């Protein structure tokens, strides 16, 4: 029965309502959007195996951002610091603090966008984590009540989650190069061909 005992330095991000357990095989890291949802998550999350890490605003599009800009981004840095995996030539999947990375964005259209910006980051600079089946997407039935958020999306005994699985890496690499790539023509042509008004 492993756990924690406080008093530790940790040196983790200012936010991040880290859990109590220390076993990267049961604990969960919830990447929410804004402190409006984070507070609702931070309070009523079973502070033992579920840590809430609030992301503020829209995460940088890595596909259109210089590497010098990615290493300067604080939000992404607070994400890699929470996982404790490493960056690029130091990415160790066998040293991640969480075996369950649950993306919990808002149920609005914008939430779907931030959800898109994350998956690109998780696929471009955290591939091993996704290939290991750690990145999951919450399936809410959002700024809801405390007992509401847990009883619907956070409680494993009733919650419904979705495992992000990669079929063809070739088709995957193309989808990101089109939807979030620097090319606007292919993206505009995609939206024009796959949209039912």
């Amino acid at each position: 029965k492993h756990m924690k005992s406080g008093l530790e330095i940790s040196n983790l991000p200012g936010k991040l309502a880290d859990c109590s357990s220390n076993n990267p095989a049961e604990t969960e890291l919830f990447i929410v959007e804004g402190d409006s949802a984070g507070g609702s998550a931070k309070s009523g999350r079973n502070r033992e195996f579920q840590a809430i890490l609030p992301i503020r605003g829209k995460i940088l599009n890595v596909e259109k951002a210089s590497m010098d800009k990615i290493l300067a981004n604080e939000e992404i840095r607070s994400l890699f610091t929470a996982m404790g995996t490493g960056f690029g030539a130091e990415f160790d999947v066998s040293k991640a603090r969480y075996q369950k990375l649950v993306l919990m964005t808002d149920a609005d259209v914008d939430g779907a966008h931030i959800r898109t910006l994350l998956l690109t980051l998780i696929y471009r600079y955290m591939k091993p984590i996704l290939e290991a089946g750690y990145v999951y997407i919450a399936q809410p039935p959002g700024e809801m009540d405390d007992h509401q958020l847990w009883e619907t999306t956070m409680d494993p005994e009733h919650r419904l989650m979705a495992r992000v699985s990669v079929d063809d890496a070739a088709e995957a690499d193309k989808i990101f190069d089109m939807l979030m790539g620097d090319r606007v023509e292919p993206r505009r042509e995609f939206i024009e061909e796959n949209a039912v008004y």
């Binding site: 898109t116 998956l119 997407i137 919650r159 979705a162 992000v164 699985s165 079929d167 088709e171 995957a172």
Partner: peptide
């Protein structure tokens, strides 16, 4: 989890 589902990366994107 109890009721987990699978979602393709390309499909959700």
């Amino acid at each position: 989890d109890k009721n987990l589902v699978n979602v393709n990366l390309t499909k959700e994107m």
